[PDB]
């Protein structure tokens with residue numbers, strides 16, 4: 001075999017957190033760039049099971065819209081995850097505050113968001129947590145979902161399993177996830193997408209949590225869109241968010257339909 005092909009240099013860190021340390025690894029021969037997550041299984045009850053599922057799931061993914069997987073290699077506590085690098089950073093830094101971005105692009109990024117999700121759900125896999133700082137980019141600004149830590153299989157042998165685990169992100173989390181003891185899983189993800197849109201359409205979140213106890217959120221129901229944060233969102237998409245961000249998860253436009261949307265299939269715009 002070719003010499004020095006297993007050695008990757010550690011240039012800079014891509015992040016930092018309570019998850020671990022995803023460093024940017026570069027080959028030693030080809031200079032092939034890759035990201036490496038350094039999750040640490042500590043003590044005697046916490047990650048050893050949560051990192052296994054992640055590693056266990058990333059072994060199913062295979063789409064140009066999802067953090068490509070390569071492998072891993074356990075070294076006791078220090079675990080290394082080799083996932084497709086991204087020079088296009090996160091979409092999170094592509095959103096201007098109280099502004100957003102060129103509509104013609106949000107429509108774009110949205111599509112890809114649906115492709116990955118479509119994909120996932122296709123094989124019965126919920127991400128249970130979507131958001132800009134997760135939706136990465138590449139050299140061609142091609143959206144690429146990431147972070148399958150809070151992922152879980154909702155469908156196995158054509159037998160959808162309902163959920164109950166309330167793990168996500170309060171603003172981006174669905175509303176029924178904070179109301180019903182049990183609930184489907186596909187929807188929640190779609191709802192989490194709607195935000196992503198307005199997030200790229202308004203350059204600001206809509207609320208803190210989809211609860212009647214939250215000011216604005218209450219108004220979004222009364223259809224109070226007049227000059228509210230949903231003022232920077234033209235009808236075209238806002239009409240889609242009306243259908244998306246719907247109270248009754250048992251009446252929330254799907255993806256096969258999001259696809260059928262009018263703003264969703266509008267040229268350039």
Ligand SMILES: N[C@H](COc1cncc(-c2ccc3c(c2)/C(=C/c2ccc[nH]2)C(=O)N3)c1)Cc1c[nH]c2ccccc12
Pocket residue numbers: 014015016017018019020021022035037067083084085086087088089090136146147148149
């Ligand atoms: N590990 C997390 C980051 O979330 C991730 C979890 N799992 C996987 C990834 C991940 C996977 C593949 C990746 C990247 C990131 C990545 C990031 C990147 C940054 C700049 C350019 N590229 C890349 O190019 N390929 C990222 C750090 C964190 C944990 N808790 C936090 C609280 C606040 C801020 C950060 C964190």
